[PDB]
Write a protein that binds this DNA or RNA. Structure first.
Ligand SMILES: [Mg+2]
Ligand SMILES: [Mg+2]
Ligand SMILES: [Mg+2]
Ligand SMILES: [Mg+2]
Ligand SMILES: [Mg+2]
Ligand SMILES: [Mg+2]
Ligand SMILES: [Mg+2]
Ligand SMILES: [Mg+2]
Ligand SMILES: [Mg+2]
Ligand SMILES: [Mg+2]
Ligand SMILES: [Mg+2]
Ligand SMILES: [Mg+2]
Ligand SMILES: [Mg+2]
Ligand SMILES: [Zn+2]
Lengths: 140, 193, 39, 135, 103, 77, 64
RNA sequence: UUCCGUUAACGAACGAGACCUCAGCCUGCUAACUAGCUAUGCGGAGCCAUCCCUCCGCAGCUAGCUUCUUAGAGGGACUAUGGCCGUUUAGGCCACGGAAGUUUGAGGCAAUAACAGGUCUGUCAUGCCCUUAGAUGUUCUGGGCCGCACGCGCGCUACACUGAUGUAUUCAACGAGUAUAUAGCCUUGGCCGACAGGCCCGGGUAAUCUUGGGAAAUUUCAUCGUGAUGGGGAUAGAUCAUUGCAAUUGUUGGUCUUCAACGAGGAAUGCCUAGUAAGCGCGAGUCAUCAGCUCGCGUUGACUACGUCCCUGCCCUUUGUACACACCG
């Protein structure tokens, strides 16, 4: 019955990682995870996988659909979607205390593979063209 | 410290030794907490005082590459420069490029400076010590600016201007922008003691 | 050839949403129409 | 198939395929055009016309219902106006329309009901066969 | 016999509109009708920014007026008289009802 | 470094960089880059950026390609 | 010939200087863990930080 | 001026706070074919290929469907718990936990007293004065507000390689569509056209169509090579097309050509403390046409500081005054 739909978020990038009990598949909107297209920010998407292991994923397959955000925000998003989706699957289907090991792998590395950033675009206010910046002042 | 995790998936963090125990506390390199695959993390540093001492150092170097307006925030470009830079360092030195940078941080950070303090009721610049964290902050600042200035209106690439800068600085030769700026600060501060 | 429906002024006019009010007569009638200044 | 292969290196393969896949017609305005209002010079590459085809033969493969007024956007870009601020600029449709015309005559794409341009049953085959022919 | 009759509700008022909305739903649930609602629609927010001054002097200060508009939809599988037999309760002040016969 | 102004001076295509010099210019630190050679030799680029391929087809060195036209060089082995 | 000597900030006293730009601290010499002298540090500095000192005889006064 | 308290005061009123709005958490609730996963039916392809495995399109009584979206309800944080500090009071610093510990973030509202502050050119709001038919009334034609020795302010574009150009690749959010006349404001798709722009069939008074707004910087791959260069794009010549009743003192958008100053800017001086500065583009106002502007939006995303009263100012107390249109005395 292994099926979990766990999400991850960054600024506006929302990723939803539906799962089935398969062999090794990880596909983002159908395209392989090995191909996402910041090729500098590729380890960030790969970061959960090299943290836990390809072995930990030996009986699951991943289809991680993304929408919104930008380029960098999405890679930080898929990171949580992969990382969170694993423990939710482990919580529901493997063991509750076999995921305590998994979590402390993710948490001792980076705390933001499970919990998002609340940071957002502060609104613009008048008297200037930024959140804080104000129009230049002249006296004479 | 334990963990076989490597930057860009090529360079080991074990076998880097930071000599001067003064700023061993703020080189976020040696402990296994600081190892990271990429010098790009959107960590909420600057949120509290001394928190940016916890930012991995190769990121702190990276953050400073984005200056003068037409580079602000272009961090993928900045990190890509870092990768090519360490390619060149190991290319030219065949040692641990992590060691080179942290030795380039340690040799090019001024230990003293002159500040306008006032004793007895009259102010003037007087000689003072420098805290380790501003010293690291200053060591980064000198290197990145020196690499920046040379690359400008030069066919040479920034990645390699940075690379010459770090190699010369880690050696300690009087050849880097960072080294000459460091020693002029000390000499002034020494005079106004 | 477009004036305020309230005063007949030719300047500062708000055609947006079809109010056809000047920027001042609108402000005078803004809450009555139902534009709440929430923020 | 198409998604397991690099959307760049693959299109090099498919750009080398519409050369040697027999041939087709080719405009007597091909080598002058800048492909957009905002471009500075015409495309540098001589065999750009098939690369534009190969790049745009995946568009219909990976989408459906794209007209010419949308294909213009897909290849448009920033426009620097000198003194005044730069904006977005929509590219030209003569190039985009004609690429469709050629691949229509060749059985990779067809005109689409409900509006647009839709991929062929058997054109899907080669875009998946040549896809298999990439490392 | 059993049609597709859609009731559309708009208003400037959150509380007031859900008074009517729920009453219609509980109106027809007491008749065990096929009541498919409420589908809740993105709130429209009309906006005007105007300069506070009548003379363009002083620190230029702007006030953002706005209006929330809320959009509600109910489906009833019923007749043109069963819809009207229900929708005769007191419509609260200002709430807009525009029932039409869908496809 | 008039090293696109020098790309046709007959010394170049005769021998200048066909090991006439570029044995050495990597050997300063033994594999010094394609661009360090590009300025540790006072001559710059694009007589070099053509030969960055030329020595590669001649099988004397191994090379890279990437974003900023970063390109690399190796001596021997 | 001065020899660079290391000390540790045991404690922090105030923020002296006209603009406040100088944190005044008490330092602990590592060669002799007995010499508690005042020094004037620039930059953010807490207890447990280690200051590199070129000279040592230069001693800060109270509220210097 | 918020409290603990003090106390010739006692008890109250405003302001502050509370409050109100968007953002940050809710696999819990109400749901939802104008939002949408998930499964299954088929259909297309690849391929150990026959099935299975993968990507895809189309419909349903598929859901013990609502994770993702919308919008309602309410839940949640109170410095709650722990530690040190402190009249051990009010409160301070920190730490595990947590979405969140600067009142969590940002805004709205916002006292008394005043200023001879601005606005009679927003208002058939308005006292007094001026004119009132040969008009300072109205209406029409044309010109001017745009003129150019010069000084000033907000800005746009740059002075390049952390780049220009030409490929390929592809990720948002906020808003917007007045019978708009015989398609018409936003405009999909078809065709003509090198660009510009046309002709055609249409969709939408809109989570339904435009548009899930396929945004740019960015990311790749080449070409250029320290040269006022292919940086930069002022100036000007020729022509074409659109808006409008009309384009001249070029409305604007094209094409070719012309290729200026500018080599990081003296004395001075502005804004700014985390999704912030800075970079990038988008929408809305005006609008027939014109956005180098303003109001909003999202995208990439730091350096530095966690302080002081030194300069500029503000609040309270004490003190001096020959000041009271108040030290610009
Ligand atoms: Mg350079
Ligand atoms: Mg720009
Ligand atoms: Mg507040
Ligand atoms: Mg008035
Ligand atoms: Mg004017
Ligand atoms: Mg202004
Ligand atoms: Mg140019
Ligand atoms: Mg480009
Ligand atoms: Mg506009
Ligand atoms: Mg402060
Ligand atoms: Mg006196
Ligand atoms: Mg007097
Ligand atoms: Mg005087
Ligand atoms: Zn009016």
């Amino acid at each position: 019955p292994g099926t979990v739909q766990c999400f991850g978020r960054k600024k506006t990038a929302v990723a939803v990682a539906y799962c089935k009990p398969g062999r090794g598949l990880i596909k983002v909107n159908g395209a392989p995870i090995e191909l996402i297209r910041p090729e500098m920010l590729r380890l960030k998407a790969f970061e959960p996988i090299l943290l836990a292991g390809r072995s930990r994923f030996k009986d699951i397959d991943m289809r991680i659909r993304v929408r919104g955000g930008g380029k960098t925000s999405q890679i930080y998003s898929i990171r949580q979607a992969i990382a969170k989706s694993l423990v939710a699957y482990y919580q529901k289907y493997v063991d509750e205390a076999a995921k305590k090991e998994v979590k402390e792998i993710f948490a001792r590395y980076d705390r933001t593979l499970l919990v998002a950033d609340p940071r957002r675009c502060e609104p613009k206010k008048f008297g200037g063209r930024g959140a804080r910046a104000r129009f230049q002042k002249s006296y004479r | 410290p334990g963990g076989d995790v490597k930057l860009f998936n090529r360079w080991t963090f074990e076998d880097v030794q930071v000599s001067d125990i003064s700023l061993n506390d703020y080189l976020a390199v040696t402990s296994m907490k600081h190892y990271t695959f990429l010098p790009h993390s959107a960590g909420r540093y600057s949120a509290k005082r001394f928190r940016k001492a916890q930012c991995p150092i190769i990121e702190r170097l990276t953050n400073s590459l984005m200056m003068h307006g037409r580079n602000n925030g272009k961090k993928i470009m900045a990190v890509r420069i870092i990768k090519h830079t360490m390619e060149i360092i190991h290319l030219l030195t065949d040692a641990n490029p992590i060691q080179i940078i942290v030795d380039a941080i340690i040799n090019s950070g001024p230990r003293e400076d002159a500040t306008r303090i006032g004793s007895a009721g009259v102010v003037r610049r007087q000689a003072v010590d420098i805290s380790p964290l501003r010293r690291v902050n200053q060591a980064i600042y000198l290197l990145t600016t020196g690499a920046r200035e040379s690359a400008f209106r030069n066919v040479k690439t920034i990645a390699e201007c940075l690379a010459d800068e770090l190699i010369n600085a880690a050696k300690g030769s009087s050849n880097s922008y960072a080294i000459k700026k460091k020693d002029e600060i000390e000499r002034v501060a020494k005079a106004n003691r | 050839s477009r004036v305020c429906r309230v005063c007949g002024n030719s300047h500062g006019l708000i055609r947006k949403y079809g109010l056809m009010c000047c920027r001042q007569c609108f402000r005078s009638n803004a809450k009555d129409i139902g534009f709440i200044k929430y923020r | 198939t198409v998604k397991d292969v690099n959307p760049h290196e693959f299109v090099k393969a498919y750009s080398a395929h519409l050369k040697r896949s027999g041939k087709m017609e080719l405009p007597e305005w091909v080598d002058i055009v800048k492909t957009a209002r905002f471009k500075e010079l015409p495309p540098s590459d001589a065999d750009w016309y098939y690369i534009r085809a190969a790049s745009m033969a995946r568009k219909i493969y990976l989408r459906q219902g794209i007209g010419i007024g949308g294909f213009q956007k897909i290849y448009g870009g920033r426009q620097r106006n000198g003194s005044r601020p730069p904006h977005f600029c929509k590219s030209s449709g003569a190039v985009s329309r004609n690429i469709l015309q050629e691949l229509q005559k060749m059985g990779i794409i067809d005109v689409d009901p409900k509006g647009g341009r839709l991929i062929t049953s058997q054109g899907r085959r080669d875009l998946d066969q040549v896809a298999g022919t990439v490392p | 016999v059993q049609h597709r009759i859609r009731i559309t509700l708009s208003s400037k008022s959150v509380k007031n509109l859900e008074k009517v909305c729920s009453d219609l739903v509980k109106g027809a649930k007491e008749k065990q009708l096929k009541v498919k609602g409420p589908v809740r629609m993105p709130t429209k927010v009309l906006n005007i920014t105007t300069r506070k001054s009548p003379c363009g002097e002083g620190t230029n200060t702007w006030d953002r007026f706005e209006m929330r508009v809320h959009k509600r939809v109910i489906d009833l599988v019923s007749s043109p008289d069963v819809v009207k037999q229900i929708t005769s309760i007191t419509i609260e002040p200002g709430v807009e009802v525009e029932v039409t016969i869908s496809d | 470094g008039k090293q696109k102004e020098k790309v046709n001076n007959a010394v170049l295509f005769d021998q200048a960089t066909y090991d006439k010099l570029l044995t050495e210019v990597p050997k300063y630190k033994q594999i010094t880059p394609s661009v360090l050679s590009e300025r540790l030799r006072i001559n710059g680029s694009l007589a070099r950026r053509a030969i960055k391929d030329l020595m590669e087809r001649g099988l004397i060195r191994m090379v890279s390609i990437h974003s900023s036209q970063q390109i690399f060089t190796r001596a021997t082995n | 010939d001065t020899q660079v000597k290391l000390a540790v900030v045991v404690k922090v006293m105030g923020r002296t200087g006209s603009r406040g730009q100088v944190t005044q601290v008490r330092v602990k010499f590592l060669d002799d863990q007995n010499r508690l002298i005042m020094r004037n540090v620039k930059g953010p500095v807490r207890e447990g930080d280690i200051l590199t000192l070129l000279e040592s005889e230069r001693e800060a006064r109270r509220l210097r």
